[PDB]
Structure 1
């Protein structure tokens, strides 16, 4: 019922921040003055107050006064950060009101199934993932990674000295992502696949809205992965940057309440299965608030958080206090905490839902789709679409996909080929016949319809040309 055994020797070996016996008659003074710490008094700070002027809904153009939060030098509200503390040296794990908000948010959305967990403020998802790779992987360890993944993760596993072993993704329309049959086979027959590698130490899974594939693991699929995590004693790194952006299944384009969302829409976190702290959940404010914050958090066992703290003290000594201050006060004062912030996530959900269906319509209406040259996985969450290219089985996948990429660029549509998002290119070659599409960037519906048209026009010509740029 603790994960001490899974913490890397490297992260456990890092040390922490008078210690001897005070003399018999020693009494501390009740109001000491300090000449100790190298902190400038807040009087030195150029910034006396900040007004943060907000939108009420995404894409609002600025009857009703505009929503504004005022951040003063001083506050006594325990749910707010003032600039006197916000602009001063702070605990490396984060400001208290932002840590409490993250606890409350995780209790509401994804309550861990054990009591000895904690949160830690990070500088985003990639910061959380590096913290997790460090805390679980020693030099020589193996981490299991989805064969198509968030590429930057491999830099963090490489940094920890770990080898990435690819886990096959099932590309059926009803897929959970990971191919469970091939995952079980890899774990049951480890010595036959990888005779010279130790048994895996961890699994990195983007379980909801998988990047790139868009797949989402069912609750029953997650129970089986967790059960295998117990049986083969590996850690789970859960990355969930947009699992809150749940998307109803496609219907032709032309008021969800919180309780119904939490209960029936939100797919449970691995935290909800975890009894021992073998799960570390990575969150970010990047995709729900803004990437430029460089702010997120992790959720894990007390003992895992303590080891992350000692690592942060070396390589990343705190998220920007000014940003923690702005983000905390906006969430607590304007959005009135957890439920209000969920209501802002549900407004974003509606936009993303409309955007995903529009791009899917733009494709379904295409000649390339109707002839069967292209297909689409309907994503259940997030901002990504798998766009499949039905190349003949016997053509060189990498070679034709690269030739097709040049064609898309010439047709004025930029995409990411799946071969760029692999743990191992040779391993994943045969399933690399897809582009990842993102409908998060477009300014308007016109750009989404036109994006899908250029995409499908380019594939159509490429197929008409006999799989040639011509």
Structure 2
């Protein structure tokens, strides 16, 4: 810096902000010849570019001033209306909720942290959970309680145990954050019973549930789950959706649906952070839903990604040595791998890159960073032939790691 010790101007929270060594390493990896399984990007082959071109034309013909002018903080009315009708019909979400458009779901997470969290307030997350949610919430200094996943998602029975223990200490949880369908990073889905059990606990212990659902339309097998929000009789759930993995991420348009008192406060918090979400992309998203193109395109996204999931699951079964385990997602973008014998997957990353493969070590996905033997793999966006070769390279790296 030209200011010398620029840190002298920084706030306390800014002084705690750091670049991640692993993040920086993976950025460098993505530009080289290594087969990276570390990405969290959707595949541009799934972006509906012809439909988008037709919508851009339509916008310049018919809606140009609306798309180009400042918008309201809450969002473009027609997009709000179209999303609530979609959400109603498709998922059974109740029309008594209100809706706000956000600059991606990522912004929704930051607003959640702003509107609900005082320093020390307790937030329950899954272990693992979405890394950037931990990052959004950490600005507001919560305390976390981690609830392990199994193959049927959050172990809600362990959450009950922890709630009773917190109660015995005169403490309570304020928010439970869940990514309950095709989780980033674990790939697994909370079953129906657990969703209903979560909502009983939310009533009994008086907390808010944030359901973050980017991936529910990217279903490749099985039958559709009930959204937690569709079971929410009390108005305790805030449901987050996004166009990032159903349209394209580049428009940065997401939505937040919940109790109108909650949404009103979120609108005021958002006003100061950005004035509105970009209206141009909101009009694109409105045409995409209201014109029926979303409903038509979803099955093409699904046909695209399914064989990539399946190739990766075949390669793991064929190549991985005994002791290695992995999730079996019904949808989404990720498979999550657990190593035997106490291998530390972060230390192992060095070895993996030297054998021509990369993955995200799972440690940063745990709020307590306490689990060291996990990895997140992505199947959406390496070449579909590079999945087999990637998984083989990873398998051989694990074999080498396991010996003397």
Q: TM-score, normalised by structure 2?
A: 0.83
Aligned twin of 1:27? none
The CA deviation at 1:231 is 0.5
Matched, 1:105 2:86: yes
Q: Which of the numbers 355, 364, 377 marks the counterpart of 2:327?
A: 377
Q: Which of the numbers 86, 92, 109 marks the counterpart of 2:73?
A: 92
The CA deviation at 1:60 is 9.0
Deviations 1:381-401 (A, max 9, x none): 21010112122xxx4x5xx43
Aligned twin of 1:313? 271
In proportion to residue count, which structure has more helix?
2
Q: Which of the numbers 185, 201, 214 marks the counterpart of 1:212?
A: 185
Contact 2:74 2:101 in 1 (8 A): yes
Aligned twin of 2:155? 179
- 1:4-403 correspondence runs (5 A): 58=46, 68-69=54-55, 70-73=57-60, 75=62, 82-113=63-94, 115-170=95-150, 175-191=151-167, 195=169, 198-248=171-221, 265-332=223-290, 336-337=291-292, 340-366=293-319, 368-369=320-321, 372-391=322-341, 395=342, 397=343, 400-403=344-347
The CA deviation at 1:210 is 1.6
Q: Greater RCO between the two (CA within 8 Å, min separation 6)?
A: 2
Contact 1:415 1:435 in 2 (8 A): yes
Structure 1 runs of 4+ with >4 Å offset: 59-62
Deviations 1:374-420 (A, max 9, x none): 222101221010112122xxx4x5xx433322111111111011112
The CA deviation at 1:421 is 1.1
Matched position secondary structure for 1:365: helix
Instruction: Quote the Cα distance in structure 2 between the aligned partners of 1:404 and 1:297.
Output: 38
The CA deviation at 1:108 is 1.9
Matched position secondary structure for 2:153: coil
Aligned twin of 1:436? 376
Equivalenced residue count is 360
Question: Which blocks of at least 5 consecutive residues in structure 1 are unaligned?
Answer: 1-56, 76-81, 250-264
Alignment RMSD, CA only? 2.4
Instruction: Quote the Cα distance in structure 1 between the aligned partners of 2:256 and 2:386.
Output: 35
Instruction: Quote the Cα distance in structure 1 between the aligned partners of 2:53 and 2:269.
Output: 39
Matched position secondary structure for 1:116: coil
Matched position secondary structure for 1:281: strand
Instruction: Quote the Cα distance in structure 1 between the aligned partners of 2:289 and 2:181.
Output: 24
Contact 1:92 1:313 in 2 (8 A): yes
Aligned twin of 2:362? 418
Contact 2:59 2:284 in 1 (8 A): no
The CA deviation at 1:74 is 5.8
Contact 1:376 1:385 in 2 (8 A): yes
The CA deviation at 1:239 is 0.5
The CA deviation at 1:204 is 0.2
Alpha-carbon spacing, 1:303–1:59, altered in 2? closer, same or farther (3 Å): closer
Higher CA-based Rg: 1
Aligned twin of 1:458? 397
Structure 1 residues 318-327 or 290-299, which shifts more? Answer: 318-327
